[PDB]
């Protein structure tokens, strides 16, 4: 049940600005159930790839999370970054819109006129987001346990109880976050989940935008997000060490993981 694409990974290949595949993109002409979207895709991955939908936080737009689009697609994923219907949408709405974005990618995979026709294995999907978009991602995972992975950054929701989530979930937290503090948001969310592979990585000195486009720890954060998606989306056990390991970085001020098998 594995779906191995690309050269055997190395830390350097995961830390680079791109993986092995060329990336192209298009703007969704008629977004279905969300505000706007950009689809990033590998031109020649060598097989079908999973799809990932990424949602920003409150007041934010695609730019805040856009770096993940080419970063992940270049390793073998179709990635849709969205703007929400309103910048002021809350986590439940963000979840619905994230799942609408996945749905539309899945549909376009079956549409002959799309550049991503036949590129996607629609049985392998994942969710990502920042802050309220991260809370949205975890609501998506709670509601749709067939999702293969979640990677969220500085997550926030009005409740921290994600005890029903069984999807492999990586949380990036930001040490000095004053919007969604680690001790009242990211860490309670992490600690609520007992039935899944999970991981928590706290960036030293980070503000609430520490994982966003323009961040200075992208080599490490990108490596970890790509590795997590490769391991769990693709069931690619070549990525087990990279997905499960403590980074051993002066950039990281706390690291926790559970149920990630080597
Ligand atoms: K439907």
Swiss-Prot record:
Changing residue 208 to A: Loss of enzymatic activity on PET bottle and on BHET. It is an enzyme of class 3 (hydrolase). Has potential for application in environmental remediation and biological recycling of PET and PEF waste products. Induction: Highly up-regulated during growth on PET film. GO terms for cellular component: extracellular region. Optimum temperature is 40 degrees Celsius for PET film hydrolysis. Optimum temperature is 30 degrees Celsius for PET (commercial drinking bottle) hydrolysis and BHET hydrolysis. Optimum temperature is 35-45 degrees Celsius for the hydrolysis of pNP-esters. Remains active even at 65 degrees Celsius (about 60% of maximum activity). Its EC number is 3.1.1.101. Changing residue 212 to F: Increases activity towards 1-naphthyl butyrate. It catalyses: (ethylene terephthalate)(n) + H2O = (ethylene terephthalate)(n-1) + 4-[(2-hydroxyethoxy)carbonyl]benzoate + H(+); (2,5-ethylene furandicarboxylate)(n) + 2 H2O = (2,5-ethylene furandicarboxylate)(n-1) + 2,5-dicarboxyfuran + ethylene glycol + 2 H(+); an acetyl ester + H2O = an aliphatic alcohol + acetate + H(+); a butanoate ester + H2O = an aliphatic alcohol + butanoate + H(+). GO terms for molecular function: acetylesterase activity; carboxylic ester hydrolase activity. Salts and glycerol enhance the enzymatic activity in vitro towards pNP-esters, while detergents and organic solvents reduce the enzymatic activity. Changing residue 64 to M: Increases activity towards 1-naphthyl butyrate. The keyword Amino-acid biosynthesis does not apply. Its main location: secreted. PETase retains the ancestral alpha/beta-hydrolase fold but exhibits a more open active-site cleft than homologous cutinases. Involved in the degradation and assimilation of the plastic poly(ethylene terephthalate) (PET), which allows I.sakaiensis to use PET as its major energy and carbon source for growth. Likely acts synergistically with MHETase to depolymerize PET. Catalyzes the hydrolysis of PET to produce mono(2-hydroxyethyl) terephthalate (MHET) as the major product. Also depolymerizes another semiaromatic polyester, poly(ethylene-2,5-furandicarboxylate) (PEF), which is an emerging, bioderived PET replacement with improved gas barrier properties. This is Poly(ethylene terephthalate) hydrolase. It comes from Piscinibacter sakaiensis (Ideonella sakaiensis).
